[PDB]
Structure formats: structure tokens, C-alpha cells
Amino acid sequence: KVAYATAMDWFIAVCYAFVFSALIEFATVNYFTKRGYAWDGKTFNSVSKIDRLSRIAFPLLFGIFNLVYWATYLNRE
Amino acid sequence: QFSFVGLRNTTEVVKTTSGDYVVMSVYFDLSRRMGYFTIQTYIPCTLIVVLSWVSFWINKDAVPARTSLGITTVLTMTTLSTIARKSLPKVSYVTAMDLFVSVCFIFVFSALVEYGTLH
Numbered sequence: 001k002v003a004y005a006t007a008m009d010w011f012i013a014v015c016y017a018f019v020f021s022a023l024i025e026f027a028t029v030n031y032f033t034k035r036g037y038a039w040d041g042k043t044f045n046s047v048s049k050i051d052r053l054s055r056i057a058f059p060l061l062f063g064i065f066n067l068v069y070w071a072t073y074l075n076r077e
Numbered sequence: 078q079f080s081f082v083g084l085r086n087t088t089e090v091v092k093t094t095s096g097d098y099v100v101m102s103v104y105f106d107l108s109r110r111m112g113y114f115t116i117q118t119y120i121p122c123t124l125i126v127v128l129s130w131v132s133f134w135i136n137k138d139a140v141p142a143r144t145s146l147g148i149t150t151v152l153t154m155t156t157l158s159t160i161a162r163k164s165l166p167k168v169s170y171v172t173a174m175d176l177f178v179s180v181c182f183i184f185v186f187s188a189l190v191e192y193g194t195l196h
């Protein structure tokens with residue numbers, strides 16, 4: 001037990017923010033999911049701009065976070 | 078766990094079967110810190126309660142999705158309560174952490190019952 005958060009705790013917390021934001025993002029898409037039925041090979045739900053933007057935003061931002069975290073901690077004196 | 082607040086000394090004559098004995102006692106005053114318990118117990122329980130909350134924004138028509146979210150939430154809440162109580166000794170009285178986990182139980186079970194009555 002310690003009264004402070006280790007760097008492991010910070011990485012775990014940021015990954016927790018990423019997964020919780022993935023859940024929040026799906027909830028945001030679900031709010032605008034007007035139709036229940038899916039595409040059939042009559043209108044169909046186009047892929048949400050939220051999803052299409054997140055497919056780049058989440059991994060890229062996570063990679064930037066990985067760069068920042070590992071650069072900050074590995075090179076520390 | 079704690080922080081040393083201070084020390085205090087006493088000297089009293091205890092009576093026992095073998096005679097009267099002068100006993101000198103040092104009380105160290107310790108005050109607990111909850112930061113590890115927040116990141117250990119309180120934060121996960123609040124996050125799972127928010128997971129119970131997010132069920133409402135999910136469409137009501139999605140019966141498997143709603144039911145799955147509710148059951149996962151309440152069952153992992155049971156598991157979290159079990160481990161949190163494992164952190165404690167075996168004592169027969171409800172503590173503050175037990176009160177918080179009980180309220181979290183009420184919330185997650187209420188969300189599941191809310192979808193049950195909604196359907």
C-alpha cells in the first residue's frame with residue numbers, strides 16, 4: 001500500500017480512460033442509431049461519422065500517449 | 078496506511094491476581110490515508126456504477142445489450158464487494174466501505190430492475 005499513484009497506475013488510468021471513452025463513444029453512436037435493422041445486400045444506417053473519425057482518432061492519440069509516457073519515463077535520470 | 082500524529086504516555090496501577098503492578102503505556106496516534114483505497118476500491122466501484130448508468134442511454138429495444146450490461150455490472154459488483162471485504166478482517170459489523178459497496182449494489186441492481194420494468 002502507498003498513498004501515491006505509481007507510473008503503472010498512470011498508464012493503467014489512461015488506458016482505463018481510453019476503454020471508458022470507447023464505451024462512451026459507442027453510447028454516443030447508439031444515441032444517433034436511428035434504425036435497428038442493418039444493411040441488406042428503404043434506408044439503411046450509414047456508418048456514423050463518430051465511428052469513422054474514432055477509427056483514426058483513438059489509435060493515433062493512444063500512440064501519441066505511448067510516445068509521451070515511454071519517452072518521459074525511460075529517459076529519466 | 079496511517080500517518081503518525083503523535084505520542085502520549087500514561088502510568089497507572091493495574092490490579093490483578095498476583096498483585097498491583099505499575100503499567101506505563103505509550104499511545105501512538107495513527108490516522109488512516111484512503112488514497113490507495115480510493116484507487117483500489119472506491120474508484121472501481123464508481124466506474125462500474127457509471128457503467129450501470131450508461132445502460133439507460135442504450136436503446137431499450139436492445140434486450141440482450143441491456144440485460145448483458147446490467148448482469149455484467151451487478152456480478153462484477155459482487156466480485157468487487159467480495160475482494161474489498163477480503164481486504165478487511167473477519168468482523169461482524171458493517172463499515173463505511175461496506176456501506177458504499179452496498180449503495181453501489183443498490184444502484185446497479187436498481188438499473189437492472191429499471192430495465193426489467195421498462196421491458
Ligand SMILES: CCCCCCCC/C=C/CCCCCCCC(=O)O[C@@H](COC(=O)CCCCCCCCCCCCCCC)COP(=O)([O-])OCC[N+](C)(C)C
Nearest residue numbers: 047052054055056057058059060061062063064065066067
Ligand atoms: C495489434 C495490431 C493488430 C493488427 C491488425 C492488422 C491490421 C494492421 C494495420 C491495418 C491498416 C489499417 C487500415 C486498413 C483499412 C483500410 C481501409 C480503411 O478503412 O481506412 C479507413 C481510414 O481509417 C484508418 O485506416 C485508420 C487505421 C489506423 C491508423 C490510425 C493511425 C495510428 C497508427 C497506429 C500507430 C500508433 C500511433 C503512432 C503515432 C506516433 C478509411 O475508411 P474507408 O471506408 O475505407 O474510406 C473509404 C475508402 N477509401 C479509403 C479507399 C477512400
Ligand SMILES: CCCCCCCC(=O)OC[C@H](COP(=O)(O)O[C@@H]1[C@H](O)[C@H](O)[C@@H](OP(=O)(O)O)[C@H](OP(=O)(O)O)[C@H]1O)OC(=O)CCCCCCC
Nearest residue numbers: 024028029032033034044045046047048049050053054057
Ligand atoms: C459525451 C457527450 C457526447 C459528445 C460527443 C458529440 C459527438 C456527436 O454525437 O455528434 C454526432 C453528429 C452526427 O454523427 P452521426 O453520424 O453519428 O449521426 C448522423 C447524423 O444524425 C445525421 O444527421 C443523420 O442523417 P439525417 O440528417 O438524419 O438524415 C445520420 O443518420 P443516417 O444517414 O445514417 O441514417 C446519423 O447517423 O456529428 C458528427 O457528425 C460527428 C461529430 C464528430 C465526432 C467525433 C468525436 C470524437
Ligand SMILES: *[C@@H]1O[C@H](CO)[C@@H](O[C@@H]2O[C@H](CO)[C@@H](O[C@@H]3O[C@H](CO)[C@@H](O)[C@H](O)[C@@H]3O)[C@H](O)[C@H]2NC(C)=O)[C@H](O)[C@H]1NC(C)=O
Nearest residue numbers: 082083084085086087088089099100101102103104105106
Ligand atoms: C510523558 O510523561 C512525562 C512524565 O509523566 C510528562 O511530563 C510531565 O508533565 C507534567 C505536566 O506537563 C509536568 O508537571 C508540570 O511541570 C511543570 C514544570 O516543572 C510545572 O510548572 C507544572 O506546575 C507541573 O508540575 C511534569 O513535570 C512532567 N514530568 C517531568 C519529569 O518533568 C510528559 O508530558 C509526557 N508526555 C506526553 C504526555 O506527551
Ligand SMILES: CCCCCCCCCCCC
Nearest residue numbers: 013016017020021116120121
Ligand atoms: C483503478 C484506476 C482508475 C483511475 C481513474 C481512471 C479515470 C479514467 C476513466 C474516466 C474518464 C472517462
Ligand SMILES: CCCCCCCCCCCC
Nearest residue numbers: 017018021057058061064065
Ligand atoms: C478520442 C478521445 C480519447 C480520450 C481518452 C484519452 C485521455 C487522455 C488524453 C490523451 C493523452 C495524450
Ligand SMILES: CCCCCCCC
Nearest residue numbers: 024027028031131134
Ligand atoms: C455516457 C453517455 C454519453 C452520451 C450519450 C448521448 C449522446 C449525447
Ligand SMILES: CCCCCCCC
Nearest residue numbers: 059062063066067070
Ligand atoms: C505497434 C508496435 C509498437 C512497437 C514499438 C517499438 C518498441 C517495442
Ligand SMILES: CCCCCCCC
Nearest residue numbers: 063066067070071074
Ligand atoms: C507505437 C509507439 C510505441 C512506443 C514505443 C516506445 C518508445 C520509446
Ligand SMILES: CCCCCCCC
Nearest residue numbers: 115116119120123127
Ligand atoms: C472518490 C470516489 C467518489 C468520486 C466522486 C464521483 C461523483 C460522480
Ligand SMILES: CCCCCCCC
Nearest residue numbers: 024028031130131134
Ligand atoms: C453524460 C452527459 C451527456 C448526456 C446529456 C445529453 C443528452 C440529452
Ligand SMILES: CCCCCCCC
Nearest residue numbers: 190191192193194195
Ligand atoms: C424480483 C426481482 C425484480 C423483479 C422486477 C421486474 C419488473 C417489475
